[model samples]
Target: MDYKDDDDKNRALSPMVSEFETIEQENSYNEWLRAKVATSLADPRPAIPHDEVERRMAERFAKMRKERSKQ
Candidate 1:
């Protein structure tokens, strides 16, 4: 299998993608989770485990909060 072949491009050949937009998005998600950790502490999700639910919420809020603060 050729690692540099076009066919392998779409596949996650390595654990890291090293793309600018993606790297930016990843950092953004991390920050979002940090905020959600604060929000979920206030409103917990019933179906998801407390920690897991908060993690999901954090990602959801990360982008929202960043965009909002910019304005």
Candidate 2:
């Protein structure tokens, strides 16, 4: 038989532990997210203009649509 109430045990033992198999995996992912945010904040490149980004995305979508139409 399966272990009794193991789910409750895990939930009771850890806070903010969802969508992960174990608390250790959740902690590892949190650390990874913190590092990613820190690195992004420390990056030196100038931010792209919103309009320029929009134009580039539009061009990309148009190219993708053209390729899809060929299939």
Candidate 3:
């Protein structure tokens, strides 16, 4: 295939075509996501375990359901 035709086909098939107008902007957004994740991981605050969160939520929801049924 001609090089120009290959380039055109790739451009038309780009996954970021809808989400981003330019490759540079897509790269910038990806960098931002990485930085945000890095910051969260580096934080000194205590992190709650997933199961603890689920347990709390379950209790909260059960209370809400009990109150609703009482009405």
Candidate 4:
């Protein structure tokens, strides 16, 4: 049985974390928040330099790859 409304779908798709009264509520809040921020006319936040972003992301993947190799 795969029947699901929008909220139900969101609950299943939302990030799994320790917070929230319910998974559905967490999903609902985050979904609403993301949509609001994305559409809002507020000035965008300052951007990080591309080089710093690259190094951080590369470190993340390297750590993950090392962990994977150990297992």
All candidates' lDDT scores?
A: 0.61, 0.66, 0.63, 0.67
Q: Which candidate has the highest lDDT of all?
A: 4
Task: Give the per-residue lDDT digits (tens) of candidate 2, residues 1-71.
Answer: 66645553454455563965676667667768976777675866555548988798889888888667552
Please state the error at residue 67 of candidate 3 in Å: 65
lDDT of 1: 0.61
Tens-digit per-residue lDDT, 4-42, candidate 4: 564554436436655645775676787799877775776
User: Whose TM-score is higher: candidate 2's or candidate 4's?
Assistant: 4
Candidate with the greatest TM-score versus the true structure: 4
On lDDT, who's better, 3 or 4? Answer: 4
Q: Write model 1 residue lDDT over 5-62, tens digit each, in one string.
A: 5643344445265554464465566568977777765756445547878799888888
In order of lDDT, best first, we have 4, 2, 3, 1
lDDT, candidate 3, at 41: 54
Ranking, TM-score, top scorer first: 4, 2, 3, 1
Residue 7 CA error for candidate 4 (Å)? 7.1
Total clashing residue pairs per candidate? 1, 0, 0, 0
- Give the TM-score comparing model 3 with the true structure, all chains together: 0.29
- Check candidate 1 and list the clashing pairs: 32-62
State the lDDT at 34 in candidate 1. 71
Question: Model 3, poorest ten-residue lDDT window?
Answer: 1-10
Distance from true position, residue 60, model 2, in Å?
Answer: 39
Runs of candidate 3 exceeding 4 Å displacement: 1-20, 44-71
